[PDB]
A = this chain, B = another copy of it.
Amino acid sequence: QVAEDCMGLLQLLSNGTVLRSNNQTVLFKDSIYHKPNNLHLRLYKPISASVVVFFHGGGFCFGSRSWPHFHNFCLTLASSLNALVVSPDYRLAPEHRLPAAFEDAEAVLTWLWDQAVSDGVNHWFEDGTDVDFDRVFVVGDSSGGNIAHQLAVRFGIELTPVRVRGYVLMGPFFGGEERTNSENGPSEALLSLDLLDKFWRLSLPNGATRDHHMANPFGPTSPTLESISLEPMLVIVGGSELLRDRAKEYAYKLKKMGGKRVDYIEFENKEHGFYSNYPSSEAAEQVLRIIGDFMNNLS
């Protein structure tokens, strides 16, 4: 008996088996980063070149570096930012429930450090400029945003050769039992309250609640943020998103808490993933515009 059914593409059974179902620049190739679980990431280098870790979305239950509009976005950041993109796959729920994805995220960083301490052996594209941007900037779409937060909070000097500078949080997938105002009311194209709940049910540990940490940063079990020092962040949200106020309430709290540098930008009437979905739309290039600044002012 289907215990859970995510749009038909994911079927978690009662017993628990889980069933499943435009121009060109830049250059890209793939590699392993974690052998015991066989996890691979992809590198993008703009070719026009003379690091941006992208964690893809999918509410922790869908997504792959190979996916089209995930890939399409990765080329766009790479080219226009003149940037090396690191787009890893992370383990997916319900087969791999949280904190699986977060553990894998930390593994991505470790791989970068181990490639950096390699005595700068390009080991990616030898025809290359040593560390176009040693400065690294995490960018998280949907669920990917949640990883970026957990990666700030975790690294409050670990992996010294590599220094996270900024955190881009793009429609971050945050949780909580109390809906606020965006969740209630109008379901988006593709995004409905029950669907966001589903994502959580499949993602978080069995028996957990939406206010569990790794979902709500301000849940009872979640840690205190004021003490911990954060790196400068950037939250981008669509006006029509169901996670609009979640990311506002988030940003609101961080900025009002002291010391943390958090910028917040809304795009009016846009739905989740207007970036890396309908690219080359004015809104998209604007996102490009802001992240560039976010990084050059964070240089």
Residues of A whose CB lies within 8 Å of any CB of B are 13, 15, 17-21, 29-32, 35-40, 91, 95-96, 115, 118-121, 123-124
Number of copies: 2
A133 to chain B, nearest CB (A): 16
Residues of B within 8 A of A121 (CB): 13, 15, 17
Residues of B within 8 A of A13 (CB): 121, 123
In the bound assembly, the distance between CA atoms of A115 and B17 in angstroms comes to: 9
For the complex, would chain A's binding face be called helix, strand, loop or mixed by DSSP majority? loop
B31-A96 in contact (CB<8A): no
A17-B123, A123-B15 known; A96-B30 Cβ under 8 A? no
Known contacts A37-B37, A37-B38, A38-B38; is-contact A95 B15 (Cβ 8 Å): no
Q: Which of B30, B96, B119 meets A38, CB within 8 Å? A: B96
A-B contact pairs, 11 of them (CB 8 A): A15-B118, A15-B119, A17-B121, A18-B32, A19-B30, A19-B31, A20-B31, A36-B36, A37-B38, A38-B38, A38-B96
**Residue from B15, B30, B95, B118 in contact with A32 in the complex, judged by beta carbons closer than 8 Å:** B95
A17 B95 Cβ-Cβ under 8 A: no
